[PDB]
Amino acid sequence: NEVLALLSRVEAKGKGILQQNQIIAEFEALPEQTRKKLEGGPFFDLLKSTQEAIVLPPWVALAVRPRPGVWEYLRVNLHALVVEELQPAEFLHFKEELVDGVKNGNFTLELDFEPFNASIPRPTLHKYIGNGVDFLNRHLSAKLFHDKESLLPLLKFLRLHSHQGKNLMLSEKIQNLNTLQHTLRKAEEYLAELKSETLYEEFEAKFEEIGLERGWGDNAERVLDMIRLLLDLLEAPDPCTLETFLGRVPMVFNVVILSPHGYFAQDNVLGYPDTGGQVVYILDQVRALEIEMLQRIKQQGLNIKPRILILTRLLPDAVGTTCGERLERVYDSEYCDILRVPFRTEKGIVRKWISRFEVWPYLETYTEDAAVELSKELNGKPDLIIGNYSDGNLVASLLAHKLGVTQCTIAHALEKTKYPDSDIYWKKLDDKYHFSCQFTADIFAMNHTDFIITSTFQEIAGSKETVGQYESHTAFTLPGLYRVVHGIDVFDPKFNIVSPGADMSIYFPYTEEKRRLTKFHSEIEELLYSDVENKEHLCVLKDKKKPILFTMARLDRVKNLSGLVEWYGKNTRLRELANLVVVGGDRRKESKDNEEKAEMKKMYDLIEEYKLNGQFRWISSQMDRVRNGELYRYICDTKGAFVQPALYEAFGLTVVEAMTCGLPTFATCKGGPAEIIVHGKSGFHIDPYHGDQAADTLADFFTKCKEDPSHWDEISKGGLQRIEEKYTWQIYSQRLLTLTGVYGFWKHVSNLDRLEARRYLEMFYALKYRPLAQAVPLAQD
Amino acid sequence: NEVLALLSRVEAKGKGILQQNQIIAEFEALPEQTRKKLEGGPFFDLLKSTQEAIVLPPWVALAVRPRPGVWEYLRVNLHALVVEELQPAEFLHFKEELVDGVKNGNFTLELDFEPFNASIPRPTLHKYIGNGVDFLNRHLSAKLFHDKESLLPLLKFLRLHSHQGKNLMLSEKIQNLNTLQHTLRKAEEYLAELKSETLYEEFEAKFEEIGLERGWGDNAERVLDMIRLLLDLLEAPDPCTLETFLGRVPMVFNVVILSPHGYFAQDNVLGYPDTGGQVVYILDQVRALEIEMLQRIKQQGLNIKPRILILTRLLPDAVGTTCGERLERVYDSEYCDILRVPFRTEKGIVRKWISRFEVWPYLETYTEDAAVELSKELNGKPDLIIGNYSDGNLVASLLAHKLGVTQCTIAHALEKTKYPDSDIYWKKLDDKYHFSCQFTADIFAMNHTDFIITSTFQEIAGSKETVGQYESHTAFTLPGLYRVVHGIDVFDPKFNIVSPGADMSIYFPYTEEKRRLTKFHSEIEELLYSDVENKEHLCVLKDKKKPILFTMARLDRVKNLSGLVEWYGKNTRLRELANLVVVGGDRRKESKDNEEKAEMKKMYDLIEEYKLNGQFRWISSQMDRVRNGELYRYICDTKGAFVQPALYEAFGLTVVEAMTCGLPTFATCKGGPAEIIVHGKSGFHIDPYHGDQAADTLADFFTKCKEDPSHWDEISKGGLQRIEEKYTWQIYSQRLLTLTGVYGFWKHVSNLDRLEARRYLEMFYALKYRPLAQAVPLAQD
Amino acid sequence: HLSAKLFHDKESLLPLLKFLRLHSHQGKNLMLSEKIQNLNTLQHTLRKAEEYLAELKSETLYEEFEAKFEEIGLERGWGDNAERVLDMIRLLLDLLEAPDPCTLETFLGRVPMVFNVVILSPHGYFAQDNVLGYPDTGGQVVYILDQVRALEIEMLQRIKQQG
Ligand SMILES: O=c1ccn([C@@H]2O[C@H](COP(=O)(O)OP(=O)(O)O)[C@@H](O)[C@H]2O)c(=O)[nH]1
Ligand SMILES: O=c1ccn([C@@H]2O[C@H](COP(=O)(O)OP(=O)(O)O)[C@@H](O)[C@H]2O)c(=O)[nH]1
Ligand SMILES: O=c1ccn([C@@H]2O[C@H](COP(=O)(O)OP(=O)(O)O)[C@@H](O)[C@H]2O)c(=O)[nH]1
Ligand SMILES: OC[C@H]1OC=C(O)[C@@H](O)[C@@H]1O
Ligand SMILES: OC[C@H]1OC=C(O)[C@@H](O)[C@@H]1O
Ligand SMILES: [K+]
Ligand SMILES: [K+]
Ligand SMILES: [K+]
Known part of the structure; x- marks a missing residue:
């Protein structure tokens, strides 16, 4: 029946040449189609499972995702009955034409890791995704x-x-x-x-x-x-x-952990640019890990003293912090130290803070210096090396190679999902974000590491309807640069889901009075309810008796706090039910960060546009986790809610923080929080792409709660249980140490096949990364 | 020998920080040593197998070559008893250090093709070197x-x-x-x-x-x-x-041969810069090959019309030549054509001839154009693609990749051997020779091709005492660029020795009178013996009855014609016995080639310094092989001899031509002619590094021949039988076509493992070759 | 194989x-x-x-x-x-x-x-004369006599050539 499919197609062309997500996809076409749809049946599914359509005038290319991990590509005539099957490279061809006007040069680079992975067969079953150590054990x-x-x-x-x-x-x-x-x-x-x-x-x-x-x-x-x-x-x-x-x-005795960027410290850093849950994660991680290591060392009859080193950047000029000191003991541990090494060039050390997008030129020299320093602190070499995010994973790979050490990596986020179409559009984005450097590091570290830890299944394979964070790196292209035909495989045996948690000494249920810290209430009250407008807080709350709608985060575009503010401002129903309190940005000082600066200005304007004074309190970065624990519990007292409106959230530690304190949570459905929250049970999902529906959804919650306060209690308990079941630190460390053992061995058994991939990766780093990184403009003191 | 061994090392540090070559690194040390040798003990065996020694402060590094294709590296303490084994990469550190002062950046490129080759087991047997099809046949x-x-x-x-x-x-x-x-x-x-x-x-x-x-x-x-x-x-x-x-x-039906550089033609060319035995070899090759293909096709019951295309550059401004026409039938064939295609940039085509050292930036566009053209000419696609030298191999590889065709490469020379220490010293050489492009291309094609043809065993593995041409590419480094840890392996099953010949209608024994071409005798006599000095010939022969010491070749540095002239000029014994006649350079025109110009200046000076007039005739490039055959035969008449005084000679076709006409030949022992000639039987070896002995050897031969004329006849017969046995074209084509059969099939079986190597090379070309080649400055019309 | x-x-x-x-x-x-x-x-x-x-x-x-x-x-x-x-x-x-x-x-x-060879032919009247044509005595005896003669020659030949 061609009168129909041509209906949708002719509607597709009507959109003009560009990309279309399934977001739009059928949105414009199938539902937005006339009642003539009358479809269900065949070809509805094929379109329903379509992840993206690249539309150029004669043709439309379709990427189809039947199951997570399984992909088929198709070219179909805008006007015609024809349907042809594309090879991944061919579909990546379409994308390149959409942008450069031409496909990439004939002899331009195709990155293909597939032939290098033939060592072990690969699981085809959904159950081994994020489960790879189980598959490996059986092989x-x-x-x-x-x-x-x-x-x-x-x-x-x-x-x-x-x-x-x-x-x-x-x-x-x-x-x-x-x-x-x-x-x-x-x-x-x-x-x-x-x-x-x-x-x-x-x-x-x-x-x-x-x-x-x-x-x-x-x-x-x-x-x-x-x-x-x-x-x-x-x-x-x-x-x-x-x-x-x-x-x-x-x-595992000596562990080395890499996190170069941001201001990494135990106090007065949280919420600065680049400084966030990755720091929170690692600090929780080392403590849980040291405890487990000591335990193991003892059980096996050994007296060895462990050492865990967190390698980050030394920042001489960041005042009000310990960032300028070489060695720092992690609170509440005997053996965990933060080790800090400076960035430097031929001209000597570089003092100023540098954005995570700009650090690429400094990473190689950093690896050299870091190797010397950790080598002064350690007795014997590192037994395990863990990379963190892009720069950390990059460095972690170089060190593991250099020192002959089992490597693990953790993304903590992958920008390519946070900045949609940043791959295909990378060129226009490059002066600012340098994503050519970053997507290179990612692809590199991803294949170089021995095993990979993720916080959720979705971070790897996503869901039935939508693609995962890694899965999206399987096939992509950067037109004019190179083309990744197979860059990673969701079924890779190296993927292991091991979920983090929130420190249970800091965040507990608001209902335990014995443990509540009341010595903080004066400060909290001034913070929330005072009439002073300054760099610590903006506007004022008129009625202290309302429930508070609360959010806390670094302030950048993706975090989308200005979005929340707008949703809140437009909706009279919600402004009536609840006060909006947003912690983000640090206004005590001059913002040196692009997105932050941008976002700050939007915030100011929104305050005037929606006349938010009296319903709205805009707070500066809150850097003490202990008082934060109390702040969350305080929001609970007002019978309010936590909301997380990120356009994309890789994991979302604050989602876990709020739930753990008993605070009912509304979180973005884009990214990790989709897996964390079970809608209607442990919390609610909202779509940052429809914010008015989001605000109404919140208005609804608060209205029900008003009529039936037990509604609130249900969700609170829902969240509390969800956390207990899924996210906690006890299991994590044991899980990690076991993976290190198994992958460590498998290293020696599989050593001979990985030799080619090792050389291939070495060349990619040398001839692709280095040049890219050297092109990034240096910071100037 | 704790006493004795210490003693050699003693003298070793003497020569200072520098390159130690076998001759130097022994001949000085041991022979300039004392009777304290008593060296028939073990330390002398490892000592004399040393190919080169890197002289530094207290360490000296040694590359040791027990057998052909078997290497071990080690470092001994200048003053010490200690000697520690070195990995290939480490040995190459020393070289990098001895030049740049530091090793290469830790994370800078290391090429290792070893793991990519594991597909087949490898022969350890000297017998299988150059024999690989026999090995692949058993696998x-x-x-x-x-x-x-x-x-x-x-x-x-x-x-x-x-x-x-x-x-x-x-x-x-x-x-x-x-x-x-x-x-x-x-x-x-x-x-x-x-x-x-x-x-x-x-x-x-x-x-x-x-x-x-x-x-x-x-x-x-x-x-x-x-x-x-x-x-x-x-x-x-x-x-x-x-x-x-x-x-x-x-x-094999359609065959494509690649020869971009030089002036490639059938007349008015040979002796121009870059135009040489490569052009000669190829013209003979296709003719021989066509006759066999037609044969095969008939025997197998087919009527197919074969086609052989030789792809070269189109040169619109080269006058006196056919080099500016797109299609040229090859003499004495129905199906062999020369197909010329222009070099071009965005600015349009490039007219002026370009030295083989500068062609690099044009080759990729060349490949594209060439695919279009040869597509117009061929009915069906190429069944075989043969690369020739560096550019031809580079282009042949791109083509075979693009068209999916079985590929063979033929080096015809490898400049790394012709220019000693040009890899380590490459940097200072680059503005002139661009060896960074060339070596890159050589390594690229060498590993990219399906099989390799060489003209001699020596070309691959050399001799017991000396290192082969390809073998010298197993491990080397270009400090500051990259380092090759395994670039090729002398035992690779793809190496096949298939020896060429000289056209027998052109070159034959001087003693068959019916066949001598007498109508050329007038011209020849004018050439050698006339009293006219002009751009065709310089100086004059005073006595027409002397034997002639003859050489013919392109004029460049490595050909070392100027060396011969000096040896001859110094040696009064030889000048008395024989006249020296040298064909090289075209003085009819103004030289555009650097080495030629340099070499001409020396020639002129030598004429005056040694007062060579009356004993010496310097002849311009002789471009007609038909008369050339007669020229050789005429030298025989005078009971003269051929001399090939090259500093290195990859094969030496002129040696074959000379031997085939019955001219007793004295050829350089560096490179191919070492294998071609059997000393004292089929000819004589001379060492261009000792030139005075070269001249005395010649002197001795002439003296003995004056005393015993049958001495001359003896060597003449030696040469003829020698050629008959090894170098002739009849066997060649059958061999070539069988190889295509076997390696073609192997393609389909081995396809999955070479998939890894395919990606590695693809990335090496893209990220290494292209950037290098784009840096070579373009010609300006 | x-x-x-x-x-x-x-x-x-x-x-x-x-x-x-x-x-x-x-x-x-x-x-x-x-x-x-x-x-x-x-x-x-x-x-x-x-x-x-x-x-x-x-x-x-x-x-x-x-x-x-x-x-x-x-x-x-x-x-x-x-x-x-x-x-x-x-x-x-x-x-x-x-x-x-x-x-x-x-x-x-x-x-x-092969140095020592042992050949088995139990039945018949096995001999060099006055036998052939008897019951059970026939080409088998003829075969073996020719066989060993030929074999011995080859064996000596081989033994010599191998030093
Ligand atoms: O002003 C701030 C901003 C963030 N955080 C903490 O930083 C972490 C943010 O982690 P999450 O995964 O939620 O966001 P990320 O910044 O890592 O993307 C959480 O522990 C927050 O409580 C904070 O304490 N004060
Ligand atoms: O002035 C010259 C110089 C060279 N040749 C021919 O060019 C070829 C040179 O090939 P060879 O292998 O000897 O040296 P190449 O030039 O390839 O290094 C031989 O056939 C020579 O007879 C020639 O005909 N005239
Ligand atoms: O009276 C006889 C009968 C037989 N023979 C020999 O016995 C052998 C018979 O062998 P054959 O293969 O013909 O038949 P077999 O007897 O072994 O079954 C031949 O060499 C005959 O010459 C003989 O010499 N005299
Ligand atoms: O650690 C979790 C967070 O860390 C860092 C990011 O960029 C977020 O997207 C993640 O959710
Ligand atoms: O292969 C033919 C000739 O080509 C090029 C060379 O340099 C010679 O050594 C060869 O003999
Ligand atoms: K042990
Ligand atoms: K067939
Ligand atoms: K034995």
Whole structure:
């Protein structure tokens, strides 16, 4: 039936040459179509699952996403009955024509990682997405089952394994699978007799003779399960055994964590440009991690002192902060230190703060210096290196290569999703955002790392209707630069979802009075309710008795706080039900940041346009997490809500913070918060793209709550439970240390195939990144 | 020898910080040493296998070459007993350090092709160097043996195989090994009944029913052997069967040869800058190749008209030549044409000749234009593409990539060997030679091609004492640009030695009188013996009865004609015995080539310095091979000899020409002629680095010949038999076409592993070659 | 099939090494000595041997180089003279590198192996005269008599040629 499909198509052309999201997609076409739709049926789905249509005049190219991870591309005539199948490169061809006027030059670069990944097969099942360590365990387990050449790497691994001059596991005496099999069995028999609680020092003497070094356990009971696991791996390997053994072998002692950009510190930084949850995340991470490391070290019978170093930039001139000092102890830990190294050039060190978009030229030299410094602090090399965001992941990759260390990366966000069509439009965006440098770093670190941690499933594969953050890096193009035909694969065994949490000492339910910090209420009240207008707070709240609609964030475009302010301003119904309180930007000082500056001006104007004085209180960055905990609980007291109107949010720690304090939450459905909140149960989703519907949705909530206050309680409890179930730090660290064990081993087994990819990546860095980065204009002191 | 060994190192530090070459790095050290040698002990063996030694402060680094293609690097302490093994990358550090003062940036490019080549096992045997098709034959032979997933590709090959819309071998009626097996047997039974001479047309009707298309053979007999061959590969594959069948399948019809630089023509060219044996080789090659292709096509029962196209630059302003016409029939062929295409920029075409060292920025646009043109000429696409030298290989690679055609490359020379230390010292050489472009292209094509042809073993692996031309490319560095850790491997199965020849109608023994061309004797005598001095010839021969010491060649630095002149000028013994005649340079015109100009100035000076008038005749470029043949023969008449005093010579076609006419030849021991000539038997070696001995050797030969004239005749016969045995064109074409058969099929089997290497090279071209080439300044018309 | 199984499989070559390693007759060792425990050493030894031999005149008798070979792990049975010892060592190198059916057959054919042969023909009246035509006594007896004569000649020929 061609009279119909041509209906939609002729409507497609009516739009003119440009990109169209499924946002528009059928919006303009199928629903916006005349009642003649009468479709359902075939070709409705094909269009329903269409992620984007690139429309140029004769043709429209369609990218179709049947399942997460599965993609087919199609060209169909604007006027015709014809439908042809595009190869990914060919569809990327369409995009390039839409922008440059021409497809990229014949011999212009195609990035393809697919042929480099043929080492392990790949899962086709939705269940292994973000689950890759499970798949890997099952592959290793099989590859290991009665293969002498397969088991050897394990023996060599345990044989060479050591820390700070001291030998661990097997000694040099065990040279072959037989001797090992024999020693284990002999050792098993000896211990099987002894009392469970016998300390390793008793049988230490005996073990050393037969070739066993320390780290099997603190006492005989533990050592026995350990030695039995290994006998089991040499006999009949299965995944649970494998994972347990590898996760248990003490490995991680010295950890190195990379976060170069922003002002990274424990006080008076939160909410400055570039300074946000990534800092909050890491500080929570190290503490949870140190606790777990000590625990492990002890259990395996070791006295080793751990060290965790967070490498960031030293900022000499940032005053009111500790950013200018080389070494800083992380609060509430023995072994975690922030290590700070300066950016520098041939001219000497660079003093001023630099935006995260501008740091690229300094990253390589930073890697060199960082290597020297961490090497002065550590005893022995790093056992694990974790990259964070783009610059951190970049540096993390170089260091891991340099030092021969298991690497992990964490994106914390991927700009390509936050700035829609920033890939295809990169050129016009480059003087400002330098996304050519950044998308290069990302693609690079993504493939270079050993394993990857994400905060949610959606960060990888998205949902049924919409594409994930990484998934969107599978096929893209930067016209005039290069074309990524397969840049990453959602099914990659290196992806692991491990969810973060909020420090439970800082954020707890507002209902526990014993724990409420009331010593903060005077300050909070001045902050919320005072009549003073200054750099700390703008306008004033007329009625202190209303519920408060609250948000807190860095102030930039994507965070879209000026959007919220507008939605709020237009809607009389909502302004009547609730006061709007927004924490963002720091007005105490001169903003050096582009987006922030821009956003500040919009805020001012909105205040005048919608005459917001008396309903609205605009607060400066709140840098003390302890008082913030209380602030959230205070919002609860007023029976209000948290709202997060980001155009895109990669994860959203404040969403978790609010829910954890019992504050009912309305969060953007674009990005992580879609997975975090279960609509109508643990909170509500709103669409930043329809803000008036958002404001009405909030007005609705507050109206119901007024009629039936128990409505409020439902959501509050809903959120509280959701957090308890999904996001908390206890499991995280154990999960991470286990992945490091398994991926660490897999490194040596898979070492020979990754050799080509290693060289390919080295060249990409050298001949693509470096030149791009050197083109970025230097900061001038 | 804690005493003795320390002692050599002693002298070593003497020469200071510098390059240590075997001659220097031994001849000085050990022979300028004392009787303290007593060196028939072990340390001398590793000592004399040292190819070069990097002299620095207290360390000296040694590259050691026990056997051809086997290298180990190490560092010894200048004053110390300690010697520590070095990785290839580390050895190359030293060189980088000795020049720039620092190593290359830690993260700057390191090329390693090793991991990309693992597809096949590699021969460790000297015997397989240059023999790789024999090796690939045994790999495929084995991979093929009772493996179904293995045999399918061969069936897909034969089924898909067609030319110009005409099906060949198997039709679509054969979908699987079972039916193929069944059909062949059926065909066999039928054919064995018929008379041997039965033409394919008779049984064609039947063959088409059972799925057999044309190309098995012209008669019953031949069709029978081919069918039996294939049945064999389905049953018991062996290397000989495999090779023979693959060589027999009609494949090569359209052939494209790439030779952009020089003035490429059939007359009024040879001896111009850049115009040389490459032009000669190619013209002979195509003729030989056409005769074989026609042969094959006939034998396999086909009427196809073949085409061979030689692609070169169109030069509109080169007068006296055919170089400005687009299409030129090659003398003595029906199907071979020269196809010229212009260089151009956005500004339009570029008219003026450009030195082979400067062509780089034009090649990519050249490739595009050339694809358009050769597409107009060919009916169907190229079945084979052959690259020639650096530019030709660069373009051939782009083409084969673009058109999906089997690719061969032929180096014809590798400048890195011709210009010692031009890699390490490349930077100061670059404004003139652009070796950064060239070496990049060479490494690029070298790894990109399917198979490589060389003219001699030495060209690949050299000798026991000296390093091969390609081999010298295994590990090197260009400080400040990049470093090649493994760039090529002498044991690579793609290397094939296929030796060229001299056209036998042009060059033949001086003793066959019926054939001598006497009508040229008037001209020749004027050339050598006349008293006129002009741009055609300089100075004069006083005594017409002396033997002549003859050389002919392009005039450039490496050809070292000026060296010969000096050796001759100094040596009174030789001047007395013989007249020196040198053909090189075209003085008829004003030289546009740097080295030529430089070299002319020296020649003039040498004439006056050594007062060469009356013993010396300097002749301008002799451009007609027909008379040239007679020229050689005329030298023989005088009982003279040929001398090739090159500092390095990649092959030496003139050596073959000379030997083929019965002219006793003295050729440089550096490069190819070392293999061509067997000293004392088929000719003599001379060392351009000791020139005075060169002149004495010549002197000795002439002296002995004066005493015993049969000495001359002895060497003459040596040369002739030598040529007869090794270098002739008859075997060449068959060899080439069999290689295409075998490497063509290998393409389809090995396709998946070379996919990784394909991306690596693609990225290397894009990100390394293009930027370099775009930096070479353009010619200005 | 052997040519294939043999191509670049270490595990698959070991059998060949062991074969030539144990091979001996009447207490005298043949081919490889006990000195060679692995393929790398054999590779190296065969290499060294080839090099040494290539220099000596074709007609040089084994005893000359017997001393050296003994040193490096090479026992007798390679050939009578240098020329033949050379060809045989090359064949073996070839099998270690790129095994093919012709080379395998040729090398295994040439290894001195068969010395004592035992032939079974129990029934009939088996003899050289006054037998043929008797019950059960016929072409089989004729066959075996011709057979052994021919065999003996070839065996002597082979034994001599292998040194
Ligand atoms: O003015 C501010 C702005 C942000 N934050 C904290 O910074 C983190 C922001 O993390 P999130 O993931 O929500 O946003 P991000 O900045 O990382 O994109 C949360 O802990 C906030 O409570 C804060 O304490 N004061
Ligand atoms: O003035 C000259 C110089 C060279 N030749 C021919 O050019 C070829 C030179 O090839 P060769 O391999 O000897 O040196 P190349 O120029 O390739 O380095 C030979 O056929 C020579 O006879 C010639 O005919 N006239
Ligand atoms: O009276 C006889 C009968 C048989 N023969 C020989 O016995 C052999 C018979 O062998 P054959 O293969 O013909 O048949 P077989 O007896 O072995 O079944 C031949 O060499 C005959 O010459 C013979 O010499 N005299
Ligand atoms: O850590 C979570 C946040 O961090 C940093 C970002 O840019 C946000 O989009 C994320 O949600
Ligand atoms: O290959 C033919 C000639 O071409 C180019 C050269 O430099 C010579 O050495 C060769 O012999
Ligand atoms: K150990
Ligand atoms: K076919
Ligand atoms: K033996």
